[PDB]
Design a protein around this ligand. Structure first.
Ligand SMILES: Cc1cc2nc(/C=C/c3ccc(O)c(Br)c3)sc2cc1N(C)CCOCCF
Ligand SMILES: Cc1cc2nc(/C=C/c3ccc(O)c(Br)c3)sc2cc1N(C)CCOCCF
Ligand SMILES: Cc1cc2nc(/C=C/c3ccc(O)c(Br)c3)sc2cc1N(C)CCOCCF
Ligand SMILES: Cc1cc2nc(/C=C/c3ccc(O)c(Br)c3)sc2cc1N(C)CCOCCF
Ligand SMILES: Cc1cc2nc(/C=C/c3ccc(O)c(Br)c3)sc2cc1N(C)CCOCCF
Ligand SMILES: Cc1cc2nc(/C=C/c3ccc(O)c(Br)c3)sc2cc1N(C)CCOCCF
Ligand SMILES: Cc1cc2nc(/C=C/c3ccc(O)c(Br)c3)sc2cc1N(C)CCOCCF
Ligand SMILES: Cc1cc2nc(/C=C/c3ccc(O)c(Br)c3)sc2cc1N(C)CCOCCF
Ligand SMILES: Cc1cc2nc(/C=C/c3ccc(O)c(Br)c3)sc2cc1N(C)CCOCCF
Ligand SMILES: Cc1cc2nc(/C=C/c3ccc(O)c(Br)c3)sc2cc1N(C)CCOCCF
Lengths: 55, 55, 55, 55, 55, 55, 55, 55, 55, 55, 55, 55
């Protein structure tokens, strides 16, 4: 076989899960957050996949 | 087989789940948030997939 | 087989779920949010798939 | 087989769900929000798929 | 076989999970956060995959 | 076989899991955080994969 | 002060919430159930406060 | 002060929450259940407060 | 002070939370269940407070 | 002071939390369950407070 | 002071937490379970407080 | 002071935590279980407080 990509690719066979991202956010997984009190200014309480590039 | 992509591709066979994103947000997964009190200015309480690029 | 894409593609066979996004938001998954009080100015309380690019 | 796309495509066979988006928003999934009090100016209380690009 | 990529690629066969990211965040895994009180200004309480590049 | 990459690639066969990242965050693994009280200003309480490059 | 009860009482002052039950069911709290498929004969899918005394 | 009870009482002062139960079920707390597929005959999927006394 | 109870009592002062139960079930706490597939006959998947006295 | 109980009592002062139980189940605490697949016949997957007295 | 109990009592002053149980189950504490696959017939996967007296 | 009990009592002053149990299970402590695969028939995977008296 032959393949040429510029990116971003994701090429496969017999594949149970696939995610391609440029951005941006993708949530595909099981996630449970239980929480009782959030205070403070300002605290990232429960972050799973996170990116902060403030300018 | 032969394939040429510019991106972003996601090419496969026999594949249970697929997500392609440029952006942007995609939520495909099970997610449960239970929460009782959020305060503060300003706190990201429960973030799963998150991207903040303020300018 | 042969395939040429510019992107964004998502090409497959025998595939249970598919999402293609450029944008933008796509919500296809099970999601439960239970919440009792949100305060503060301004706090992202419960974000699952999120993108903030304010200019 | 042969396929050439400019994007955004989503090409498949035997496929239970499909979403193509450029925009914009698409909601196809089960979603339950129960909520008791929202205050503050201005707090994103419960966001599932979200994109904010204010200029 | 032959392959030439510019990156970022992810090329495979017989592959159970795949993630390609440029960004950005991708959450595909099981995650449980249980939490009782978050205070302080400002403390990253529970971060799983995290990136902070404030300027 | 032959392969030329610019990076970042991840090329394989018969491969159970794959992650490619430039960024950014990717969470694909099982993660359980149980927590009772977070205080202080500001303390990284429970960080699993973490990167802080404040300028 | 003086008090004599036979039960079931609930006596208080300055009290934000009160429930007295003999029975029976009382639901006063925030509750969110999101659900996609229930099968089987017969499975209690999502029970919060539950009592089964079949004879 | 003086108090004589037969039960079940709940006597207090300055008290934020109170529940008295004989039965029976009382749900006063925040609860989020997100769920995707329940099968089997018969499996208690997600039970929070539960009592089964079949005869 | 003086107190005589038969039970079940719960007597207090300056008390943030109170539960009295004979039964029966009481749910007053924050609870998040996220779940993707339940099978089998019959398996208690996620039980928090649970009592089974089948005869 | 003087007190005579038959049980079950719970007598106190200046007390943040109280639970009295005869039964039965009481859930007052923060609880997060995230789960991806439950199989088998029949396996107690995730039990927190549990009592099984089958006859 | 004077006290006579039959049991089960729990008598105190200045006391942050109290639990009295005859039964039965009481869950008052922070608990996080994250889980990916449960199989087998039948295996107690993750048990925190547990009692099995089958006859 | 004077005290006569039959048991089970728990009598105190200035006491941060108290548990009285006859049964039965009580969970009041912080607990985190993260788990990836459970198999076998039948293996107690992760047990914290456990009692098995099958007859
Ligand atoms: C193997 C492969 C296969 C492949 N298949 C495609 C789509 C076909 C199609 C089939 C039917 C359609 O209708 C359409 Br539209 C499209 S792209 C693609 C790319 C590749 N590679 C780059 C792998 C080479 O490994 C080099 C590493 F050294
Ligand atoms: C400067 C910049 C540079 C940049 N470079 C990229 C790589 C693309 C690529 C990806 C994979 C490839 O193979 C190739 Br070739 C190329 S995205 C990107 C975004 C930015 N920004 C400043 C947008 C942030 O918005 C401001 C916040 F408000
Ligand atoms: C990482 C971080 C992230 C973070 N993110 C925010 C979002 C605000 C917002 C964003 C978007 C909105 O729409 C609104 Br309203 C509000 S505050 C904040 C604070 C922090 N930290 C300081 C902890 C770093 O610790 C360094 C060493 F200790
Ligand atoms: C500067 C920039 C740069 C940029 N570059 C991209 C890469 C595309 C690509 C992706 C994959 C590829 O293979 C190739 Br080639 C190319 S998107 C993008 C967006 C931006 N912005 C500033 C928009 C933010 O809006 C302002 C917020 F209000
Ligand atoms: C400066 C910069 C540089 C940059 N360089 C990249 C590499 C791409 C690549 C990746 C893989 C490759 O093989 C090749 Br070739 C190339 S992304 C990127 C983004 C930026 N920014 C300043 C955007 C941040 O936005 C400001 C926050 F508001
Ligand atoms: C502890 C246990 C508990 C347990 N509980 C069930 C509930 C069924 C049900 C109960 C109520 C309902 O309404 C329905 Br429908 C269904 S199966 C089960 C199995 C077990 N074990 C096998 C572990 C014993 O260790 C063996 C060797 F060590
Ligand atoms: C046999 C029995 C006995 C029993 N004993 C109790 C104690 C009360 C007490 C509690 C605290 C005290 O201080 C004193 Br004194 C007394 S409840 C109770 C319920 C039963 N049942 C068989 C009902 C189950 O229904 C059948 C299922 F379908
Ligand atoms: C046999 C029995 C005995 C029993 N004894 C108790 C103690 C009360 C007490 C509690 C505290 C005290 O200080 C005093 Br005195 C007394 S409850 C209880 C329940 C039962 N059963 C068989 C009901 C189960 O139902 C069958 C399942 F379907
Ligand atoms: C100290 C105490 C205090 C107490 N107070 C009650 C309710 C008053 C009330 C007050 C106002 C009302 O309106 C009502 Br109704 C009722 S029962 C009780 C029991 C006791 N003890 C047994 C402790 C003795 O320690 C012996 C150990 F050695
Ligand atoms: C046999 C039995 C005996 C028994 N004894 C207790 C002690 C009370 C006590 C507790 C504290 C004290 O100070 C005093 Br005095 C007394 S409860 C209890 C329950 C039972 N059963 C068979 C019920 C199980 O139901 C069948 C399952 F389906």
């Amino acid at each position: 076989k032959k393949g040429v990509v510029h990116g971003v690719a994701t090429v496969a066979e017999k594949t149970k899960e696939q995610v391609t991202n440029v951005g941006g956010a993708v949530v595909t997984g099981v996630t449970a957050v239980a929480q009782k009190t959030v205070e403070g200014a300002g605290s990232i309480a429960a972050a799973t996949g996170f990116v902060k590039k403030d300018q």
